[PDB]
């Protein structure tokens, strides 16, 4: 981001964000299923 203009939305592509939370789609279960154990 360099953003030569006054408005902040006029900037270039946003700085890279590598945060990943696949659980919300891969383990969306209230009771966490422990790995290596019978998950029933």
């Amino acid at each position: 981001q360099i953003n030569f203009y006054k408005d902040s939305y006029a900037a270039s592509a946003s700085k890279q964000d590598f945060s990943q939370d696949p659980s919300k789609f891969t383990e969306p279960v209230a009771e966490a299923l422990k790995a290596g154990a019978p998950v029933l």
């Binding site: 203009y5 006054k6 408005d7 006029a10 592509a13 590598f18 945060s19 990943q20 696949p22 019978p38």
Partner: protein, 243 residues
């Protein structure tokens, strides 16, 4: 003024450039962000979700029959049940999957995959299967004699109704291509076969013929590069407001 020379590449419009642009609405105030569940940060989060695949992709099954697989009580032993090609680029069971659809936007892929098979019989139906991933190089195994030598997992039905087989990353190169020549070294991934291990046994009161539902996804070590226009959807003219 400042000394200046226009280099080659000036006055060009590159669709992948990253530059700031003049704001059309000065001092505009956007709507404040509101927390919405299910925010996606990377395409790799969606290829890790389960997705059923069309194993029964024959010219006899219409619709949902193609997402489910015949499983029979056998009068013989060591018989092959079904095959799964691993050609995501070409027309196969793995194309219409989250993993497949998303990775078909890209050209290079890497990393191990996983397949989950769920048994949908009756509670009294018992059985044993063997699922084998065979690395490429030769023909598809037809007998369990040759299939057992490659990677394999023995699945026994019980309280846990689904099994998972990991297709590991066995490749000389770091990445593989979604090439139209699925028969080439850079594109071929391997073979998946299912063999009955002992038999499928069901009582008289239970339905003799059961089904397997197959699903495929990626693991944490999956990577994609060189994203491209997918051949999934096409266009012949500008879409009107009519039929």
């Amino acid at each position: 003024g400042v000394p200046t020379c226009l280099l080659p590449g000036s006055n060009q419009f590159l669709t992948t450039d990253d530059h700031s642009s003049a704001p059309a609405f000065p001092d505009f105030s956007p709507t404040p962000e509101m927390h919405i569940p299910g925010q996606v940060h990377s395409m790799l989060e969606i290829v890790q979700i389960e997705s059923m695949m069309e194993i029964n992709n024959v010219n006899d099954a219409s619709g949902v029959e193609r997402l489910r697989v015949q499983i029979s009580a056998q009068s013989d032993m060591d018989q092959l049940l079904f095959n799964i090609p691993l050609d995501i680029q070409l027309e196969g069971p793995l194309r219409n999957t989250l993993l497949g659809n998303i990775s078909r936007y890209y050209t290079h892929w890497s990393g191990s995959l996983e397949m989950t098979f769920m048994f949908c019989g009756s509670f009294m139906t018992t059985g044993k299967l063997i699922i084998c991933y065979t690395p490429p190089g030769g023909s598809s195994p037809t007998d369990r004699m040759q299939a057992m030598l490659a990677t394999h997992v023995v699945w026994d039905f019980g309280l846990q109704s689904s099994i998972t087989i990991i297709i590991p990353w066995i490749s000389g190169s770091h990445y593989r291509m979604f090439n139209t020549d699925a028969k080439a070294i850079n594109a071929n991934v391997g073979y998946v076969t299912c063999f009955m291990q002992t038999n499928l046994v069901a009582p008289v009161g239970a339905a003799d013929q059961c089904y397997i539902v197959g699903m495929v996804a990626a693991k944490k070590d999956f990577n994609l590069r060189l994203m491209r226009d997918s051949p999934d959807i096409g266009q012949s003219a500008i879409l009107p407001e009519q039929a």
